[PDB]
Amino acid sequence: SGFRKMAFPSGKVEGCMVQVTCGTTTLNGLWLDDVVYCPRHVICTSEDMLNPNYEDLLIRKSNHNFLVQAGNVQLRVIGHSMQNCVLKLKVDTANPKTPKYKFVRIQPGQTFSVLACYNGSPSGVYQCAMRPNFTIKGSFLNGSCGAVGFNIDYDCVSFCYMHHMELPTGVHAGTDLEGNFYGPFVDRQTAQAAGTDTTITVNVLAWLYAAVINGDRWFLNRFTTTLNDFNLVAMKYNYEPLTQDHVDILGPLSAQTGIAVLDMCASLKELLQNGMNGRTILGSALLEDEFTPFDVVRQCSGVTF
Amino acid sequence: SGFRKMAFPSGKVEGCMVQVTCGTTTLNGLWLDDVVYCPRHVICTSEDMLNPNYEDLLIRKSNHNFLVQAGNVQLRVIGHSMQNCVLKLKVDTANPKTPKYKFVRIQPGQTFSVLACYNGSPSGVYQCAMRPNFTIKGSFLNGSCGAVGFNIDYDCVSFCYMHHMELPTGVHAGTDLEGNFYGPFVDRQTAQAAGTDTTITVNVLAWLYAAVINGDRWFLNRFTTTLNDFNLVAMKYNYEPLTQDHVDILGPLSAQTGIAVLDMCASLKELLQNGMNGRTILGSALLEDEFTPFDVVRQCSGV
Numbered sequence: 001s002g003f004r005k006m007a008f009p010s011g012k013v014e015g016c017m018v019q020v021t022c023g024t025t026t027l028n029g030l031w032l033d034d035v036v037y038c039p040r041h042v043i044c045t046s047e048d049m050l051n052p053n054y055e056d057l058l059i060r061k062s063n064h065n066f067l068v069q070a071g072n073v074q075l076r077v078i079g080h081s082m083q084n085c086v087l088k089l090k091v092d093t094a095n096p097k098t099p100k101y102k103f104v105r106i107q108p109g110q111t112f113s114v115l116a117c118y119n120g121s122p123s124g125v126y127q128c129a130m131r132p133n134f135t136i137k138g139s140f141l142n143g144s145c146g147a148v149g150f151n152i153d154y155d156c157v158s159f160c161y162m163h164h165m166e167l168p169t170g171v172h173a174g175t176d177l178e179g180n181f182y183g184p185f186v187d188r189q190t191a192q193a194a195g196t197d198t199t200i201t202v203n204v205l206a207w208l209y210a211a212v213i214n215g216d217r218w219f220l221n222r223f224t225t226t227l228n229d230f231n232l233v234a235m236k237y238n239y240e241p242l243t244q245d246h247v248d249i250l251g252p253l254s255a256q257t258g259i260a261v262l263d264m265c266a267s268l269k270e271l272l273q274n275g276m277n278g279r280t281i282l283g284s285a286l287l288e289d290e291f292t293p294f295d296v297v298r299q300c301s302g303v304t305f
Numbered sequence: 306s307g308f309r310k311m312a313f314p315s316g317k318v319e320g321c322m323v324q325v326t327c328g329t330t331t332l333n334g335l336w337l338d339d340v341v342y343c344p345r346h347v348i349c350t351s352e353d354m355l356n357p358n359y360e361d362l363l364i365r366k367s368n369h370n371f372l373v374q375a376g377n378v379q380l381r382v383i384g385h386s387m388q389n390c391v392l393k394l395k396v397d398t399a400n401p402k403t404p405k406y407k408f409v410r411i412q413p414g415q416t417f418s419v420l421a422c423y424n425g426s427p428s429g430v431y432q433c434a435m436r437p438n439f440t441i442k443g444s445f446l447n448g449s450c451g452a453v454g455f456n457i458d459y460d461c462v463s464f465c466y467m468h469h470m471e472l473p474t475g476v477h478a479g480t481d482l483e484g485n486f487y488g489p490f491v492d493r494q495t496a497q498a499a500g501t502d503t504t505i506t507v508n509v510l511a512w513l514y515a516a517v518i519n520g521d522r523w524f525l526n527r528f529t530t531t532l533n534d535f536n537l538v539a540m541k542y543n544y545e546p547l548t549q550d551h552v553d554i555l556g557p558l559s560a561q562t563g564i565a566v567l568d569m570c571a572s573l574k575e576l577l578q579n580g581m582n583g584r585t586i587l588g589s590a591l592l593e594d595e596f597t598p599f600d601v602v603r604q605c606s607g608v
């Protein structure tokens with residue numbers, strides 16, 4: 001037993017980190033088959049990043065302007081193109097460590113592992129949740145751009161995040177592997193602010209199911225609710241509304257505990273309206289919202305890859 | 306910026322994880338060169354684990370009694386010895402993925418990465434600290450025995466932990482890679498208690514510095530304290546004493562923030578005496594003690 005934030009084993013992604021350099025600008029890229037993916041702003045000088053015209057800056061660059069390195073080994077760039085905010089560089093070598101992979105665009109509330117990475121060298125791995133305001137509460141220093149976030153299902157690596165930006169508030173913002181930002185952010189050297197954040201309701205419920213699985217069920221009440229009623233109430237507390245997908249992915253935990261989703265919602269609603277009354281759940285006075293239902297399953301029942 | 310519980314990348318260790326089965330008992334082993342290390346209770350039956358006379362059980366075993374699977378390949382055991390609670394199985398094949406490694410014994414309050422692992426397949430990675438009562442607060446389910454903890458310095462993996470046990474309180478116990486338990490625990494099937502768990506003071510102070518580096522300052526105050534008077538109050542709260550070394554290891558964090566160590570101690574003393582009201586620090590409602598000063602430096606230098 002025990003309940004912790006847990007990243008996926010990172011070896012399959014470590015074998016795909018490389019360093020990409022233009023001029024003196026360096027960052028991380030993701031080497032899959034014979035293509036390297038990285039943030040397009042690598043083509044910018046410091047002064048270019050203030051107000052960049054990426055189409056114009058790229059028109060002046062050739063394959064031979066791009067330094068791609070696995071460790072100290074150079075991979076010759078033989079083609080380049082821009083997709084949204086990500087640069088794609090065809091290299092002359094197929095990465096022999098390429099895992100089975102997909103590119104996915106995750107939803108707010110979903111979690112992923114971030115492989116922290118500097119100059120193409122992995123440095124750490126940790127778990128993150130996409131906040132409803134499309135930031136992540138990460139740990140990123142200078143040179144971290146291009147670091148990726150991923151999930152592993154079976155033996156397939158699902159890439160969902162590539163790092164670009166730190167906001168003034170100290171949270172982080174980035175794109176999917178197709179170069180589309182999560183949230184209303186742009187890759188300019190400017191101070192940008194995220195929408196007001198909210199609590200990830202589906203994850204709080206997951207966490208309550210986790211508590212119940214562990215015999216901690218004082219908070220189960222006698223009421224139920226409609227989904228619409230619950231959503232209208234939850235927004236009054238800065239909680240995200242539930243989708244039908246959210247109800248669906250709570251199913252297994254609902255079946256395992258025998259507690260219908262809408263019953264657990266009525267239980268959570270009472271907690272919001274009346275507070276914890278000095279009690280804890282799983283040892284915490286805070287309701288935790290960065291464990292998805294899959295995370296609860298991974299840690300309460302055990303899953304391998 | 307930002308501060309997060311972070312484990313080392315696990316690839317170098319994943320390549321060493323294998324599965325070891327004896328009879329009806331299966332757990333994880335660590336494959337380095339031509340040796341696979343695993344917990345020795347893999348040789349016990351249900352009846353045996355109650356009170357195993359391990360040397361007796363071990364001698365009655367043959368090489369072929371041990372099934373070692375590395376992925377889709379089975380490894381041929383050509384020998385077997387025992388070092389304390391760790392069984393050493395010789396195999397006819399060197400692990401080609403063997404990294405540069407050493408076996409170290411970690412000290413209380415130090416952190417390491419755990420590669421959670423089932424049936425020789427890794428399931429996740431997270432960071433832990435060796436607590437002063439020599440338990441760790443982990444996440445370990447059935448078939449997790451043999452999972453290892455480690456640190457990576459440059460390209461050398463320092464193995465420091467192999468998992469054996471979950472105490473009735475839900476915390477976890479294990480050995481170094483020479484088979485010596487951390488703490489007063491024994492690999493028999495009995496309910497075992499640990500000594501009273503104290504709080505790792507130098508780590509709580511480091512985490513408070515991290516909170517300051519990241520914009521959280523509500524807990525600071527104008528007061529200072531002497532080392533001794535801080536230790537008087539801390540021990541009253543079951544916090545480990547702070548040593549002059551500890552003060553010294555915190556120097557870099559004091560420099561960066563401009564808050565003297567004994568000033569941070571005055572803040573911590575007030576937090577202990579007053580609690581946190583309804584406030585949080587780095588998103589936590591509890592004083593965190595599983596981040597070392599180096600964990601904090603490596604994540605907040607330059608911020």
Ligand SMILES: *[C@@](O)(CO)[C@H](C[C@H]1CCNC1=O)NC(=O)[C@@H](CC(C)C)NC(=O)c1cc2c(OC)cccc2[nH]1
Binds near residue numbers: 332471472477496
């Ligand atoms: C290993 O996987 C066994 O090979 C496992 C560790 C996990 C089980 C679930 N959580 C874990 O961390 N260890 C054990 O199952 C054994 C270890 C001994 C050395 C054989 N048991 C315990 O850790 C255990 C026994 C026991 C008990 O026995 C009567 C009473 C209370 C608590 C308790 N823990």
Ligand SMILES: *[C@@](O)(CO)[C@H](C[C@H]1CCNC1=O)NC(=O)[C@H](CC(C)C)NC(=O)c1cc2c(OC)cccc2[nH]1
Binds near residue numbers: 143146168
């Ligand atoms: C990448 O490593 C750069 O390639 C870097 C991320 C790092 C920096 C430290 N923390 C991180 O997460 N990204 C940036 O520096 C981007 C670069 C492009 C223009 C997208 N910019 C920012 O992160 C950025 C600019 C800011 C600004 O404008 C002056 C004001 C306030 C915050 C801010 N952040």
